[PDB]
Amino acid sequence: ANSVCFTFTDFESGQQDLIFQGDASVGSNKALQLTKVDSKGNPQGGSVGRALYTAPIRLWQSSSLVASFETTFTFSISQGSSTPADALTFFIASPDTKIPSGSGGRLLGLFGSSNDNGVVSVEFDTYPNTDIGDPNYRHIGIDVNSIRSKAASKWDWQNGKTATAHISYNSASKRLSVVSSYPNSSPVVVSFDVELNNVXPXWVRVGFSATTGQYTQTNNILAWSFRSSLMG
Amino acid sequence: ANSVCFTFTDFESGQQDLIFQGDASVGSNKALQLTKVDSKGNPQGGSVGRALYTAPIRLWQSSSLVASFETTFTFSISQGSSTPADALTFFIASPDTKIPSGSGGRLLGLFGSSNDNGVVSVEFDTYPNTDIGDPNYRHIGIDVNSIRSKAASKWDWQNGKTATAHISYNSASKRLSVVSSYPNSSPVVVSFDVELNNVXPXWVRVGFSATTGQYTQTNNILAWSFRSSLMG
Amino acid sequence: ANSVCFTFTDFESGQQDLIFQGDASVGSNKALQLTKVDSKGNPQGGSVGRALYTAPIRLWQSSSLVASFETTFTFSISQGSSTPADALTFFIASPDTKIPSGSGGRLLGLFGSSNDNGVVSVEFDTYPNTDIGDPNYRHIGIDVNSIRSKAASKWDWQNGKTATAHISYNSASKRLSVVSSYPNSSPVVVSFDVELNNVXPXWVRVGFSATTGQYTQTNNILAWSFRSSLMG
Amino acid sequence: ANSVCFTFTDFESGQQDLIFQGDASVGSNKALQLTKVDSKGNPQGGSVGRALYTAPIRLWQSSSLVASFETTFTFSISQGSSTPADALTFFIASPDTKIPSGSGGRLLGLFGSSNDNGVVSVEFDTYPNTDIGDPNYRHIGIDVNSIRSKAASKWDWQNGKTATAHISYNSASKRLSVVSSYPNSSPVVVSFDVELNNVXPXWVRVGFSATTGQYTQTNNILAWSFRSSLMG
Ligand SMILES: OC[C@H]1O[C@H](O[C@H]2[C@@H](O)[C@H](O)[C@@H](CO)O[C@@H]2O)[C@@H](O)[C@@H](O)[C@@H]1O
Ligand SMILES: OC[C@H]1O[C@H](O[C@H]2[C@@H](O)[C@H](O)[C@@H](CO)O[C@@H]2O)[C@@H](O)[C@@H](O)[C@@H]1O
Ligand SMILES: OC[C@H]1O[C@H](O[C@H]2[C@@H](O)[C@H](O)[C@@H](CO)O[C@@H]2O)[C@@H](O)[C@@H](O)[C@@H]1O
Ligand SMILES: OC[C@H]1O[C@H](O[C@H]2[C@@H](O)[C@H](O)[C@@H](CO)O[C@@H]2O)[C@@H](O)[C@@H](O)[C@@H]1O
Ligand SMILES: [Ca+2]
Ligand SMILES: [Ca+2]
Ligand SMILES: [Ca+2]
Ligand SMILES: [Ca+2]
Ligand SMILES: [Mn+2]
Ligand SMILES: [Mn+2]
Ligand SMILES: [Mn+2]
Ligand SMILES: [Mn+2]
Numbered sequence: 001a002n003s004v005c006f007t008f009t010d011f012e013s014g015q016q017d018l019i020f021q022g023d024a025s026v027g028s029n030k031a032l033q034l035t036k037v038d039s040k041g042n043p044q045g046g047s048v049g050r051a052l053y054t055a056p057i058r059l060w061q062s063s064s065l066v067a068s069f070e071t072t073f074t075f076s077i078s079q080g081s082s083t084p085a086d087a088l089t090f091f092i093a094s095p096d097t098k099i100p101s102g103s104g105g106r107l108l109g110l111f112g113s114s115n116d117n118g119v120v121s122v123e124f125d126t127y128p129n130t131d132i133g134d135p136n137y138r139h140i141g142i143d144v145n146s147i148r149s150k151a152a153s154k155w156d157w158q159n160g161k162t163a164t165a166h167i168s169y170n171s172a173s174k175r176l177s178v179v180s181s182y183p184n185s186s187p188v189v190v191s192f193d194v195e196l197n198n199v200x201p202x203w204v205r206v207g208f209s210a211t212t213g214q215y216t217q218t219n220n221i222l223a224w225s226f227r228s229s230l231m232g
Numbered sequence: 233a234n235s236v237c238f239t240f241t242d243f244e245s246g247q248q249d250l251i252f253q254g255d256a257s258v259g260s261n262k263a264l265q266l267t268k269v270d271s272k273g274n275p276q277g278g279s280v281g282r283a284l285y286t287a288p289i290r291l292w293q294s295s296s297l298v299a300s301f302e303t304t305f306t307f308s309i310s311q312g313s314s315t316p317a318d319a320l321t322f323f324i325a326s327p328d329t330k331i332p333s334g335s336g337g338r339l340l341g342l343f344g345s346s347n348d349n350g351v352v353s354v355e356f357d358t359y360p361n362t363d364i365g366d367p368n369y370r371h372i373g374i375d376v377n378s379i380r381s382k383a384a385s386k387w388d389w390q391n392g393k394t395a396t397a398h399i400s401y402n403s404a405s406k407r408l409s410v411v412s413s414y415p416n417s418s419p420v421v422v423s424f425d426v427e428l429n430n431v432x433p434x435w436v437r438v439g440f441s442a443t444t445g446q447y448t449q450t451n452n453i454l455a456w457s458f459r460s461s462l463m464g
Numbered sequence: 465a466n467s468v469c470f471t472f473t474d475f476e477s478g479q480q481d482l483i484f485q486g487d488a489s490v491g492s493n494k495a496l497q498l499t500k501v502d503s504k505g506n507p508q509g510g511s512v513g514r515a516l517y518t519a520p521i522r523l524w525q526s527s528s529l530v531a532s533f534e535t536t537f538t539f540s541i542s543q544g545s546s547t548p549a550d551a552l553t554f555f556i557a558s559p560d561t562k563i564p565s566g567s568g569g570r571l572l573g574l575f576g577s578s579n580d581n582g583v584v585s586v587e588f589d590t591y592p593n594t595d596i597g598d599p600n601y602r603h604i605g606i607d608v609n610s611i612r613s614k615a616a617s618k619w620d621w622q623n624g625k626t627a628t629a630h631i632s633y634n635s636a637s638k639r640l641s642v643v644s645s646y647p648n649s650s651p652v653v654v655s656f657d658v659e660l661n662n663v664x665p666x667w668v669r670v671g672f673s674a675t676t677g678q679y680t681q682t683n684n685i686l687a688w689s690f691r692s693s694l695m696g
Numbered sequence: 697a698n699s700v701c702f703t704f705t706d707f708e709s710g711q712q713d714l715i716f717q718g719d720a721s722v723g724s725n726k727a728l729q730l731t732k733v734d735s736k737g738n739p740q741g742g743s744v745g746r747a748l749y750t751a752p753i754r755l756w757q758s759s760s761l762v763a764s765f766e767t768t769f770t771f772s773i774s775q776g777s778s779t780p781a782d783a784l785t786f787f788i789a790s791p792d793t794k795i796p797s798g799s800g801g802r803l804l805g806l807f808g809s810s811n812d813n814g815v816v817s818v819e820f821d822t823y824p825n826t827d828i829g830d831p832n833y834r835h836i837g838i839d840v841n842s843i844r845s846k847a848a849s850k851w852d853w854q855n856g857k858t859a860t861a862h863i864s865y866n867s868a869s870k871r872l873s874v875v876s877s878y879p880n881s882s883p884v885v886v887s888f889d890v891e892l893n894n895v896x897p898x899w900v901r902v903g904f905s906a907t908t909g910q911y912t913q914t915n916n917i918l919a920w921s922f923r924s925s926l927m928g
Contacts (some may be wrong), residue, residue, distance in 0.1 A: 001249055002241045006287075007464070008233040016288040016327065016435050017233055055238075055287035056248040065883060066862045066875050068766075095248065104719060122905050166762045166927055170864050172873035172885055179868045187761060189868055203248050231768060231862055232241070297651060298630045298643050302532075304695060398530045398695055402632050404641035404653055410638045411530050419529060421636055463536060463630055465702040467711055470751075473928070476722045480752040480899050481697055491757065519702075519751035520712040559712065667712050696705070 001146045003229040004057055007034075010223065017054045019205070022099050023107065025050030031076070032087055032221035034210035043080035043216040048109040049100055052207035053226065056095040060171070060197040062229050067197070068170030071206070076220045077126060078160040084126040085215030088208060089143075090091035090167055091121030092196075095205045105213025106132060111147045120144050121209070122167055122178045122190070126157055126217060140165075142176055142192040144199055150191035162222060169196060187228040190210050235461040236289055239452045240264075242455065244345060249286045251437070254331050254341065256452060263308070264453035265272030266320055266442035271448050273446040277314035280331055284439035285458065288327040292403070292429040293462050299429070300402030301460035303438070308452045310392040316358040317447030320440060321375075322399055323353030324428075327437045337445025338364060343379045350431040352376050353441070354399055354422070358389055370396075374408055374424040375432055382394040383424035390414045399437060401428060467693040468521055472496075474687065481518045483669070486563050486573065488513030495540070496685035498552055500675035507544035507680040511571040512563055516671035517690065520559040523668050524661040525694050531661070532634030534643050535670070540684045541590060542624040548590040549679030550671060552665035553607075554631055555585030556660075559669045564615070569677025570596060575611045582663040585673070586631055586642045586654070590621055590681060604629075606640055606656040608663055615656035622646045626686060633660060697771060699828045699925040700753055704728075706919065713750045715901070718795050718805065719892035720745030727757055727772070728917035730784055730906035739776035744805040746794055748903035749922065750793040755900050756867070756893040757926050763893070764866030766925035767902070772916045773822060774856040780822040781911030784904060785839075786863055787817030788892075791901045801909025806840040807843045814895040816840050817905070818863055818886070822913060836861075838872055838888040842896055854878045859917060865892060 010030040011018075023044075025034040035047035060067050071090060086105050098120075100112030106129040107114065110121055112198075114132045123141045128134045133148040138157045141149030156165075163179035174195045181187035206226060209217030246269055255268040255276075267279035270381045292299050295421040303322060310316075315348065315354075318337050329351075332344030338361040355373045360366045365380040369388045373381030389395075397412035406427045413419035438458060442451030469496030474494040475482075487500040487508075492528045499511035524531050542548075550569050561583075564576030565592060570593040571578065574585055578596045587605045592598045597612040602621045621627075629644035645651035670690060674683030706726040707714075719732040719740075731743035756763050767786060774780075779796045782801050793815075796808030802825040803810065806817055818838045824830045829844040834853045837845030853859075861876035870891045877883035902922060906915030 001238040003237075004249075005235075005334040006237040006812040007236045009234045017236075017290070024729055053287065055285065060251070065860060066864070068864065070764075115767075125911055164761060164927075166868065168762070168764065168866050168868055170766075170873070171873045172862065172864055173869055173871040173887055175871055177866070177868035191869055231860075297628060297645055298632070300534075300632065310533075396529060396695075398636065400532065400634050400636055402534075402641070404630065404632055404643045405637055405639040405655055407637040407639055409634070409636035413529055419604070424635055463628075466705045467701075467703040468713075469699075470697040470699045471699040481700075481754070517751065519749065522713070 001058060006053060007225040008223055018041045018174055019052040019054055019083055021051070022049040023047045024051045029100045032208070034219040034221065035045050043212055043218045044216060045212050045216050046104060048104050050099060050109055050175040050207060050209040052205045056203045056205055058202060058230060059092065059227050059228060060198060060202050064230040064232050066170055066172050066231050070166065070168040071224065071226040071227070072164065072166045073224040074162050074164050074222040075161050076160060076218060076222060077157060078218045080216030083215050084217035086127050086213050087123055087125040088210035088219040089121045089123040091119060091209055092200060092204050092206050093119045095203055097205060104211055107147055109209040110143065114147055116201055118145055118201065120196060120200055123149065124155065124180070127215060140178060140180055140188055140190050141215045142178065142190055144194060151190055152196070153188050155180070155188050171195065171197065182189055189195045233288060233333050234279055237459040238285060239457040240455055249463065251284040251286055253283070253324050254281040255279045256283045264440070265457045266440055266451040266453065267444050269450055275444055275450045277446060277448050278336060279444045279445050280336050282331060282441040284339055284437045288435045288437055290434060290462060291324065291432060291460060292434050296401055296462040296464050298404050298463050301456040301458070302398065302400040303456065304396065304398045305456040306394050306396050306454040308392060308394050308454060309389060310448060310450045312448030315447050316449035318443045318445050319355055319357040320442035320451040321355040321402060323351060323441055324432060324436050324438050325351045327435055329437060336443055339379055339443070341441040341443045342375065346379055348433055350377055350433065352432055355381065356387065358414070359447060370442065372410060372412055372420055373424050374422055378424060379382060383422055384424045385420050387412070387420050403429065466660055467524060467586045469691040470480045470517060471689040478674065481660070483516040483518055485515070486513040487511045488515045489511060497682040498672055498675060498685065499643050499676050507676055509676050509680050509683045510568060510679060511519055511676045512568050514563060514573055514671060514673040520667045520669055521692050522655040522694060523556065523664060523692060524666050528694040530634055530636050530695050532622055533690070534630065534632040535688065535690040536628065536630045537688040538626050538686040540624060540626050540630050540682060541621060542682045544680030548681035550591050550675045550677050551587055552674035552683040553585045553587040555583060555673055556664060556668050556670050557583045558665055559667055561669060566673055571611055571675070573673040574607065578611055580665055582609055582665065584660060584664055588619065588644070589612065591679060604642060604644055604652055604654050606642065608658060615654055617654045618654050619644070619652050635661065685692050701923040702749060703921040704919055711756065711851060713886045715748040715750055717747070719743045720773060721723060721799065728904070730904055730915040730917065731908050732865060733914055737914040739914045741912050742800060743908045744800050746795060746805055746903060746905040748901045752899045752901055753924050754896050754926060755788065755901050755924060760782060760928050762866055762868050762927050765922070765923040766862065766864040767920065768860065769920040770858050770860050770918040772856060772858050772914060773853060774914045776912030779887045779911050780913035782823050782907045782909050783819055783821040784906035784915040785817045785819040787815060787905055788896060788900050788902050789815045790897055791847040791899055793901060800907055803843055803907070805905040805907045806839065810843055811899055814897065816842055816892060816896055818820050820851065820876070823911060830898045832860060834927055835885055836876055836886050838874065838886055840890060847886055851876070851884050867891065
């Protein structure tokens with residue numbers, strides 16, 4: 001479509017307009033639980049889950065004057081183990097994208113390696129994996145075809161509290177930016193200059209991905225709005 | 233989703249965010265050709281085709297204060313034979329809706345009979361089939377679970393010209409209305425009091441359906457915008 | 465404009481995009497206090513106030529296929545005296561509309577009499593004034609050029625609680641409807657068949673009006689969104 | 697307001713939701729003629745005119761997570777004299793902004809000098825005034841408190857043809873970008889990194905400005921849509 005927008009104030013079990021992958025599901029709390037949480041509410045380890053809006057989105061078209069999208073979502077991350085892991089992220093990929101093999105834990109279910117098939121995402125990393133590029137502290141990062149963020153900023157994750165994140169991009173400015181914050185707190189912003197049409201196909205699907213590894217945490221999306229438009 | 237909107241200014245072959253049924257396809261003209269048109273541009277008889285937005289839409293929710301939707305679309309109908317047939321329509325049905333068996337010609341591919349599984353549609357009827365309720369003239373009608381329109385008005389179809397139609401409804405007014413017109417012409421309006429949640433499931437898919445029978449015509453959708461919202 | 469939409473999640477003192485009339489102002493609570501409330505927070509009697517969006521709105525145009533608008537707002541009404549009065553309302557009038565002389569108390573600041581200059585409003589009446597048509601109980605009503613509601617329904621006002629109201633209309637259905645409710649409560653709906661272009665000018669201004677008389681209550685608008693569109 | 701959007705597909709004489717300054721008016725062609733055009737349709741010299749949306753817009757708020765706006769408009773510039781002058785522009789300024797004294801011709805009615813009261817605009821310059829910074833060719837530029845563009849690109853203006861321009865900005869990316877083009881042509885883009893809240897007040901009014909000097913041209917806005925939102 002030339003333009004598309006949708007808003008989820010909450011979710012229900014089986015949410016018909018979402019494609020669920022891995023362990024992703026909707027809990028009795030009406031939250032999108034990307035990763036596994038048991039009956040007692042304890043997040044499980046070695047979990048991976050993703051959810052995508054059912055309809056493919058036309059993110060770019062050569063004949064268009066400008067293309068843009070923006071998405072805002074709220075999420076809660078509560079540690080299970082004394083220390084949280086691994087993270088959640090908003091991502092954009094080909095319509096037929098699926099959880100890559102071996103993408104667990106530190107790969108956030110986005111990539112099958114720690115090195116037409118492009119992957120762009122904004123990660124909210126709760127566990128520093130320094131041997132693969134992670135700064136030694138929690139952070140938010142912009143990943144383009146690699147778990148190794150092209151840009152990242154220290155992020156003061158708050159256990160259990162609801163965070164609000166806003167992601168934006170248009171083909172004129174060619175800059176992907178994300179701003180995230182908690183109530184009564186200082187926001188964190190991350191930006192990266194990139195022309196998405198050079199790393200992503202014309203058609204994509206958008207959503208979230210998350211994982212736990214040895215360490216755990218809930219990765220719940222509470223609300224989500226998305227908008228994309230192609231102007232000609 | 234609590235709200236969803238999309239806009240198609242035109243279409244392309246294989247339009248990824250549309251579900252094609254029957255003969256429906258997109259032509260080199262970038263129009264959604266619901267029914268079959270040959271290489272020379274001649275509409276074929278005995279054709280049936282429908283197209284639905286890929287994502288299911290939450291049209292109602294008990295907890296909502298009000299639910300509404302509106303859609304505007306442009307379409308062109310050019311006769312193949314000296315007299316046009318059969319018609320096209322905007323419709324709403326269950327997500328897994330499929331072309332009913334024996335729904336050709338006068339049934340507009342919407343119903344399998346000329347008498348959870350509800351069907352609501354606004355038909356743009358170009359061929360009067362009087363033995364099944366059609367007034368003896370072209371008309372626009374609102375159908376609820378039956379090809380026999382609950383409400384209809386004379387429609388002065390214009391061969392080949394681009395028509396504009398607007399359909400609206402909200403659960404407060406409980407009135408489905410459609411207004412359609414051609415440039416430099418007098419619009420036609422049709423309304424019917426109905427509470428959609430009593431004839432349609434919570435989740436549906438929306439789109440178009442069209443057919444030709446013994447007589448033919450093109451049934452092309454040129455542009456289409458749709459919006460639905462659930463307020464709580 | 466052919467279409468216009470605005471959203472107020474809250475308000476500030478002097479709200480630059482609002483026209484204040486009478487006692488209307490914004491409190492430290494960030495709420496639009498239509499009627500006077502003293503330093504201690506006690507609503508004052510004999511008060512009248514209205515607030516309008518600064519920009520005139522084109523509600524109708526002869527060349528348009530269809531015209532529609534919808535507005536949603538939250539409001540709180542807390543009695544000052546043992547019994548509340550008088551009410552608040554959403555209204556539409558000419559751009560240069562002003563508080564009519566003698567419109568206090570039971571006239572809700574909308575009309576100068578209890579009998580191009582049209583006035584359409586949805587009143588939330590907290591004090592039954594039976595000698596002028598009010599049913600003997602609190603209600604919501606649709607007024608067209610008269611304080612005597614053309615349509616009304618019993619309304620179970622709840623002291624202090626935040627109510628949510630949704631008002632809608634389009635020129636195809638020609639039915640003005642309002643649905644209002646409190647959390648964990650049963651909504652109330654009021655509808656009236658009317659073709660607004662026959663009682664209102666093409667251009668108008670929209671907003672709220674409220675009053676207290678012998679008896680008092682706060683008349684606070686907490687949030688407000690409005691949308692209007694003319695399709696051609 | 698926290699968010700506001702409006703769309704003008706065309707204009708009428710006296711357009712009630714616009715503030716007209718200088719020579720700005722609406723012609724029989726339904727176009728916003730920023731500068732003077734006589735009865736015969738000949739653009740007049742030494743003209744200056746501006747038009748602003750009547751309602752003030754809240755472009756920034758300290759408590760907001762992110763602030764953004766985007767506007768798209770079509771315009772036609774037909775030379776009167778053998779060579780066109782001077783230009784038109786989209787601009788943002790304080791709500792009470794007025795045509796500065798001595799802002800004619802090369803100053804595009806935006807500044808009173810060729811060197812809380814900030815002025816940000818995107819100029820479409822049809823006449824190179826090299827002694828004041830203009831590159832020696834037609835161009836589009838981003839001006840911040842000065843007629844001397846902070847960023848500019850060569851612009852292949854086409855006499856009489858309808859151009860389409862899209863301007864965007866959000867407080868996360870902190871980059872103001874404009875893309876403009878004619879049908880069947882190569883677009884031109886101009887971007888400048890700037891944090892608008894450091895050069896503009898919280899509240900502003902938005903619109904267009906244009907002028908002719910010794911040389912002339914029409915400066916007609918044919919359509920205009922604007923959107924701004926503050927997310928918290
Ligand atoms: O969920 C955390 C982490 O768990 C697993 O990695 C463990 C160990 O192998 C690593 O060397 C250290 C690095 O500090 O972290 C854990 O102790 C993996 O599942 C990994 O993907 C994940 O990030
Ligand atoms: O496409 C027109 C029409 O064609 C076929 O019906 C024909 C005949 O059987 C009917 O009695 C008359 C009624 O006037 O119409 C045609 O001549 C069928 O395919 C029918 O569904 C369709 O409407
Ligand atoms: O604010 C309530 C009411 O107060 C005043 O009217 C009083 C009296 O004159 C009326 O007869 C009775 C009717 O029950 O109500 C009050 O006691 C007026 O200001 C009136 O406009 C207002 O509704
Ligand atoms: O509208 C064009 C231009 O006209 C006037 O300037 C003239 C002259 O004074 C300048 O030196 C040359 C520079 O090439 O241009 C004109 O001939 C002024 O009104 C000026 O503001 C304007 O741009
Ligand atoms: Ca990590
Ligand atoms: Ca028929
Ligand atoms: Ca009363
Ligand atoms: Ca110049
Ligand atoms: Mn990381
Ligand atoms: Mn029929
Ligand atoms: Mn009353
Ligand atoms: Mn210049």
